[PDB]
Design an enzyme around this catalytic site. Sequence first.
Site, PDB file in Angstrom:
ATOM      1  N   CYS G  92       9.073   3.117  -1.558  1.00 16.92           N
ATOM      2  CA  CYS G  92       7.743   3.210  -1.151  1.00 16.92           C
ATOM      3  C   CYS G  92       7.255   4.331  -2.242  1.00 16.92           C
ATOM      4  CB  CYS G  92       7.232   3.846   0.065  1.00 16.92           C
ATOM      5  SG  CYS G  92       5.723   4.510   0.435  1.00 16.92           S
ATOM      6  N   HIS G 133       5.706  -4.324   3.808  1.00 18.61           N
ATOM      7  CA  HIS G 133       5.694  -3.142   3.496  1.00 18.61           C
ATOM      8  C   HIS G 133       4.319  -2.556   3.558  1.00 18.61           C
ATOM      9  CE1 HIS G 133       7.609   0.791   1.852  1.00 18.61           C
ATOM     10  NE2 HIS G 133       6.509   1.119   1.325  1.00 18.61           N
ATOM     11  N   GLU G 134       3.610  -2.930   2.704  1.00 14.52           N
ATOM     12  CA  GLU G 134       2.415  -2.625   2.436  1.00 14.52           C
ATOM     13  C   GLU G 134       1.220  -2.621   3.707  1.00 14.52           C
ATOM     14  OE1 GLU G 134       3.977  -1.783  -1.477  1.00 14.52           O
ATOM     15  OE2 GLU G 134       1.850  -1.006  -0.438  1.00 14.52           O
ATOM     16  N   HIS G 137       1.913   0.184   5.774  1.00 16.02           N
ATOM     17  CA  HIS G 137       1.027   1.136   5.245  1.00 16.02           C
ATOM     18  C   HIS G 137      -0.453   1.312   5.784  1.00 16.02           C
ATOM     19  CE1 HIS G 137       3.380   3.768   2.677  1.00 16.02           C
ATOM     20  NE2 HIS G 137       3.884   2.668   2.335  1.00 16.02           N
TER      21      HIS G 137
HETATM   22 CO    CO Z   1       5.076   2.322   0.680  1.00 18.10          CO
END
Ligand code: CO
Lengths: 172, 172, 173, 172, 172, 176, 173, 168, 179, 179
Positions: G92, G133-134, G137
């Site tokens: 990340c 993943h994003e 976030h």
């Molecule tokens: Co990340």
Amino acid sequence: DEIKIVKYPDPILRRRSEVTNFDDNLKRVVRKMFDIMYESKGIGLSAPQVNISKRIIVWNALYEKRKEENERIFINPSIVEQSLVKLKLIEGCLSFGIEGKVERPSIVSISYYDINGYKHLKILKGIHSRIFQHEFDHLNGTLFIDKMTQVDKKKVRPKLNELIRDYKATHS
Amino acid sequence: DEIKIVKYPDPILRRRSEVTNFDDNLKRVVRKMFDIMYESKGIGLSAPQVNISKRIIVWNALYEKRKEENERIFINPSIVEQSLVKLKLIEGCLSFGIEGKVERPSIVSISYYDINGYKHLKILKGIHSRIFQHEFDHLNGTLFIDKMTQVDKKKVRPKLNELIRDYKATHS
Amino acid sequence: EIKIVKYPDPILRRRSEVTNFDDNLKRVVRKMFDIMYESKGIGLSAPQVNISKRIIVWNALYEKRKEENERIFINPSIVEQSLVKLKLIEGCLSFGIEGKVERPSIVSISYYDINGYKHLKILKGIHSRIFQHEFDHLNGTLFIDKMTQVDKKKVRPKLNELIRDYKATHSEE
Amino acid sequence: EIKIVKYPDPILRRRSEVTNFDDNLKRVVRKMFDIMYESKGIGLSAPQVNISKRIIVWNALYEKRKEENERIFINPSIVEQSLVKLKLIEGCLSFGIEGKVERPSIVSISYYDINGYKHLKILKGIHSRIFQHEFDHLNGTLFIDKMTQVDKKKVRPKLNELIRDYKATHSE
Amino acid sequence: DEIKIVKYPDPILRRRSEVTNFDDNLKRVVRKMFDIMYESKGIGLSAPQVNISKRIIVWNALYEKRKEENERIFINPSIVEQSLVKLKLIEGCLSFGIEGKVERPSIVSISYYDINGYKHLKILKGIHSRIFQHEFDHLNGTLFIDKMTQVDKKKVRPKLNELIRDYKATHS
Amino acid sequence: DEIKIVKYPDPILRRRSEVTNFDDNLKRVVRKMFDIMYESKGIGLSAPQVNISKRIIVWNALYEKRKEENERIFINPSIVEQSLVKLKLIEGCLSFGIEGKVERPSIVSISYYDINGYKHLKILKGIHSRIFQHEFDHLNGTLFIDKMTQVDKKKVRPKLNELIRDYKATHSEEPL
Amino acid sequence: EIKIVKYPDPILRRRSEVTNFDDNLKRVVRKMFDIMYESKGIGLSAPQVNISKRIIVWNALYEKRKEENERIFINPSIVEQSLVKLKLIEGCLSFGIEGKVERPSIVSISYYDINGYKHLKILKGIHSRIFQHEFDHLNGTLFIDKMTQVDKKKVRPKLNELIRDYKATHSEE
Amino acid sequence: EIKIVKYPDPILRRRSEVTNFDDNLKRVVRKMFDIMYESKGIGLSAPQVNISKRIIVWNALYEKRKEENERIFINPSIVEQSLVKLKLIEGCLSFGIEGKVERPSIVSISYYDINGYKHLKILKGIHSRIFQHEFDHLNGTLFIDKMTQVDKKKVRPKLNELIRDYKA
Amino acid sequence: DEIKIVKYPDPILRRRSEVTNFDDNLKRVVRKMFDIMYESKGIGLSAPQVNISKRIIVWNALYEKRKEENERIFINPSIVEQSLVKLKLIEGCLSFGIEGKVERPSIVSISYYDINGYKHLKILKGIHSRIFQHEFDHLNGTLFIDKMTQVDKKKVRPKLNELIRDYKATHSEEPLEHH
Amino acid sequence: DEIKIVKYPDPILRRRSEVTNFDDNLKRVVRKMFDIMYESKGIGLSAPQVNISKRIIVWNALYEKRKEENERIFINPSIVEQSLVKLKLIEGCLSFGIEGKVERPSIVSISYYDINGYKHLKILKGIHSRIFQHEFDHLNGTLFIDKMTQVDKKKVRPKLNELIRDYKATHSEEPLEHH
Ligand SMILES: [Co+2]
Ligand SMILES: [Co+2]
Ligand SMILES: [Co+2]
Ligand SMILES: [Co+2]
Ligand SMILES: [Co+2]
Ligand SMILES: [Co+2]
Ligand SMILES: [Co+2]
Ligand SMILES: [Co+2]
Ligand SMILES: [Co+2]
Ligand SMILES: [Co+2]
């Protein structure tokens, strides 16, 4: 400044000479003494011996042939230290036609003052330590017959007595 | 009886040395002393400076060129009288990588004992009178920093502190 | 004054004082060159001729005296100095004594001439050497202070002799 | 960088930092000279090419680019300036403008060379002028700050033209 | 801000300095405190020694060569801990042309504030320990003569009286 | 001088450690302390963590590459000052196969004794200050799960419970 | 904004907001891409450029910067996901750190393009990886939260390091 | 299971049941294709061959039968749909009728392949059309239910014809 | 005695290898271990690398020319002291098609047991040292990607990820894992 | 730097030597150390034996022919591992005209520093492992008579007492300690 040697039973000789203060222009006194000494064929002299109750001492180991600067002048002296080894030598003294044996330390450590007031320190040994000790004792009213031997004081009593008699026959 | 030279803040350098009694067959003591002085290249040395609290002082005004009986040895000295003229002379010490002026009398009347215990009387003057006095003080706990000039004691301050710290790392 | 002063004299340890009236006494600088010439010396400061004035004179060629080969430095000050130091052997007119002293090799400098005018110079040389000896005279510093532990030690007896010789000023005893 | 920077760029007002690594960046010094020769100027400094470092170069004979005439000064310091002063005309690659400025005639300097060796020098004349100009660049001082009240005025339009010209940034 | 270094007898030297409020834009105070110290050729300085009764302490272990950021500055300090092992070192002071041996603990543990108002924690040891403790004692009204040995106290009497004489000429 | 890493519930980890007196000839206790810690791949360790109620702290900031004298030893420590600034970092512990975020101040000013018993005075800043304060809490019966956040204490609830029941198998005379 | 944020920022733990104005601020999406390209990152979301909006961008072949190989996603939402999961090693850009996270293999996505229009899509592979993943976030979930005991511990020093550096940024006292 | 059931048969209105055993009964899927092939139809659902089971199959190119070109869906479920809708002509193998219906253009889908394996899928276009037709069959919804008011009325005659054929 | 090399995501490669006991009649375990090694063009091999959770290590500095007794065998090893001087070299592994830099000490003080059982002590330096600590790490469940640099760990992530998917085809009669 | 060899009852021989710090310009120390070892006809020497309580060990296994670089030097050593197999060899030590058998392991893993401070790691085996083990014990204040055998320690009681007696003539202006 007297042309007077003094003799045994004069009571000045037994007095305590006083410290000299003004150290200037009375080196003439120091001359009188030397003169007196030179003419009395003597080796040493203290001021009491010429009627001056001052702590002055002079001598010359070679008076038999005088020479300035063979002369030794010591004002207001003191004996700072003295040896252990002593020595019985012979002494005479201008206040006594007498002569005999006296035990004194061999070496003396001295402090004294010169003719102008300056202090010196010195070790005297030899004939110089002998006469110092003599002439220094004069300044305190000690005569050499006080330090003399029981034998010799006896061996010289008659001439002590004569000197006592010549004195007796004098007062104004 | 050591090859152990000492340095400034050692508290032995402040103790009063004691009088010598056994005056024979310990000239090796004085021999050790001379050696530590010779290799350290310095003019004088007293016993405390080699970790012996004894009344022994030795020196040699000619140390760049060693010679027997050009060496001065003084057991159990004492100052019996001193001059009035004093002199400010630069001075050094083996127990201080430091140097500077101290005012002491010019001439001194001495009394000491030789290696066989015989007393001697002596007038020390000049350079010989300088060192004696430095070394005599060591026998009494007096260090030359205590008699030094105010200008010099100040100029030498960091060095003295430097030496105290150096010494304090004697203990951990 | 035809008075070079000798070592223990207390004037050599005083702070020399700033020249105020910067004109028409040049004979003071002349007395100085004349003593320094006559005494067979390379440099000279006014305290050495018993004047507490911040004046400094020299001549790298004094064995062939020539005006305008003479250098004068009134009210000088050391603004910078090289980091490289040099151990050269020095002497002085206030001492018959000699030793090695370590001083920076080059010095940036500020001063004032005989007329009153300020100047900036990079003294590097034997000029750098002497300046540094002579400036120190102006601040009571003497070369024995900067001498080495060993040469200091070596030169102790002679230094003392000068103290003894000097003490004979009040020696009518 | 072939980045001559002009007046209103704020880097010119920052304080340039002391060079640490003195080596293999004589290229930075080569382009400063390159830019400088190409724009017909006699002095230049690192912020003027968008590098905030204490680097200053020149050539008083830039009309005949001769290397042995070129001068590099890294991490300079004015150690002393003179009392006496001087009004001389000055221009700047960062400004197509011209005028007088008063600055001391002679400077005492300290700086390092392209390999880091420290030197001490007195600049006077043409080099004392440029240095002083160029030194100011490393402090975020520009020559108009020291310009005469007369010239600053007489140079109003051009300065405002430069602020104009620079403002193309964000006026795209 | 004063070029008024004070001397022994002044009464401010015994008052308890007050805690700094307003931790900013009086950086010149500190600078003028260094200034004074720099010209006085002194290793350290506290604010009462320039007639400001605030709790400020500065120094430089190498003041004989003046460099910035070699300068230590301590505001509203205290001693949180100190070594048990102690040390006699020779101290001097800018309020006293006098000097003596003072015994202080070797290492101190400090808490202080900087020029900006931020609390820091530090173990000062050595020559930085000595000076801190000297100067800290000024903030409390303690003077170095308060902790001198009897001997050194006596040995410096005349100068302490000399300084009191000099002072009384303020009210002449 | 035990090879006894003690784990969470053990009562001794909640006791107040006593002060060291024999400051000599017991280096092996501390060496074993170091040894235990090393083979458990851990950053710091204190004497209770090896069943010795004594006020002794050690650590090696670089224990993945052990070196002598790169290790730190503190006998009878005490905290003379501490910074106002705090800092939230993740900590671990050999007494707890667990991890979490604990706020402690950045800098501590300290006093302690060496292996020979001479007093010292030191400023610890950073990870040394972090580890110190972890290990000093042990000497006082303070475990890091007390100084944690409600989040990180929740998130770790079931492993402490595993640890508690593992502990009841010290006296597992029953199938529980 | 060139504001790459790092671990201990609080914004990274906040719930990002729904994009409303779907026009002519498409350079914000480019800013994001630029930040990504120079930090050599495969993905990036709006929180990590310090923008609390719901944007997700990536280019799975970022070693070759190419328009139309980039993937932008506005206001995403996951609608279905595989029962089958995968422990892959992730990075990340808000951490110089690395570790394994168990995410489902394939997700079923609903999202919106740059101009406001809705799309339905099935992400599979590395695009399914990066999205998850994003997307995390944008919900204030970091991959250290889905990490493993073993890997969490391996990276603890590095996490504290990042925390220090952060607390520092504000008030380096 | 052979003949395609026609309109009024009540089986076309019952909810089909989820498959349990993803078996070696791909024969069931094969017959469906056969039936679907021989009635020239694009799509077929198990209901239409009287297997109340949730199986949907098609072939956009049934014209040329190609095995890999075939699409099977067991136990489907719509998980999302496009907001944009589309009116397209629909037809169904349980009716000779034909007409427009309005469904979403795209569907997010979830289903199981011939072996039980779960899949997620975006169908768009004709697969999105046909899936939505046959999924309704699984739920008993018929395509005339979602037809337009226009076309519903327009074709009610023909539904009556179917309704009658259901008779004897 | 297995003829199966293993690969990254096998979970056994993270299991603590057990201490050997019965020190005889299983030179063939060692033999097969070596057998596998040559045929798989790798310099060394450890027992878990052929699916055996037992502390064994073997190698050949010169294996591009097989020479018996130019072999080296190390049963129940233990690292007893290591160099302070570290070194970065490019390492590789028969459980990975991946290669990169790993920092390890130069010299190592070893202790181990022979094929008969007898204990030994030896200083290993250079490349032997290098091979020792790779294979030794395997026995504790450490793989060279634990000690890989940040740069090479990142630079090789796709590959490492690719190997995980590969492995996920162990139970891939289903279609939800692609290649 | 001493030419002082020390003997049995000297209490310094029982002290624990301190860790050498400043690894430079003290090669003379070691040289003096070597010098007295050749004239005292000896194979090994530690620093406490020449009255330096420092952690130093030197030896030459061929001193009947003194050769530089045949000398061995070991600053601040340690034993990291030792062999299981042990051995009773005859020993002697220069603080003793005495000899006997002492059972010590055959091989030892070592670490130390040279004359400049560089950490080495080494395996000692044989005459070298014997001298080292002995000499190392001197640095920890352990004497070979403590590890000598029940037979040999009794067999040597006389000479041990003579040296106790002869040492006692250190403080003997008292003549009753003439021997
Ligand atoms: Co990340
Ligand atoms: Co008479
Ligand atoms: Co002395
Ligand atoms: Co001069
Ligand atoms: Co310019
Ligand atoms: Co003060
Ligand atoms: Co803990
Ligand atoms: Co239909
Ligand atoms: Co491997
Ligand atoms: Co021995």
